[PDB]
Amino acid sequence: EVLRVTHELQAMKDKIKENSEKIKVNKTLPYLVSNVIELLDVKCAVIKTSTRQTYFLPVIGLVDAEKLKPGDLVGVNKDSYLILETLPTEYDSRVKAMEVDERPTEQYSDIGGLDKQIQELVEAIVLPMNHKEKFENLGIQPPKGVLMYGPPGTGKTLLARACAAQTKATFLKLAGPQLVQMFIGDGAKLVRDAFALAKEKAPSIIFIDELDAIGT
With binding defined as CB under 6 A, does residue 177 bind ligand ATP? no
Q: Residue 47 touches which of Mg ion, ligand ATP, another protein, none (CB < 5 to 8 A by kind)? A: another protein
Q: Which of 3, 138, 147, 202 forms a contact with another protein (CB under 8 A)?
A: 138
Binding site residue list: 150-157
Q: Which of 157, 168, 191, 198 forms a contact with Mg ion (CB under 5 A)?
A: 157
With binding defined as CB under 6 A, does residue 165 bind ligand ATP? no
Q: Which of 58, 88, 145, 152 forms a contact with ligand ATP (CB under 6 A)?
A: 152
Q: How far is the CB of 127 from another protein (least distance, A)?
A: 6
Comparing CB distances to ligand ATP, the nearer of 95 and 111 is: 111
- Which of 31-39, 43-51, 150-158, 196-204 is the region at the interface with Mg ion (rule: CB under 5 A)? 150-158
Three-state secondary structure string covering the chain: CHHHHHHHHHHHHHHHHHHHHHHHHHHCCCEEECEEEECCCCCCEEEECCCCCEEEECCCECCCCCCCCCCCCEEEECCCCCEEEECCCCCCCHHHHCCCCCCCCCCCCCCCCCHHHHHHHHHHCCHHHHCHHHHHHHCCCCCCCCCCCCCCCCCHHHHHHHHHHCCCCCCEECCHHHCCCCCCCCHHHHHHHHHHHHHHCCCCCEECCCCHHHHC
What is d(CA 151, CA 195) in angstroms, rounded to the nearest whole number? 28
Q: By CB under 6 A, name the binding residues for ligand ATP.
A: 111-114, 152-158
Residues in touch with another protein (CB under 8 A) = 5, 8-9, 12-13, 15-16, 19-20, 22-23, 26, 29-33, 37-38, 40, 46-62, 75, 78, 80-82, 87-88, 90, 92-93, 123, 127, 131, 134-135, 137-140, 152-153, 175, 177-178, 180-183, 210, 212-213, 216
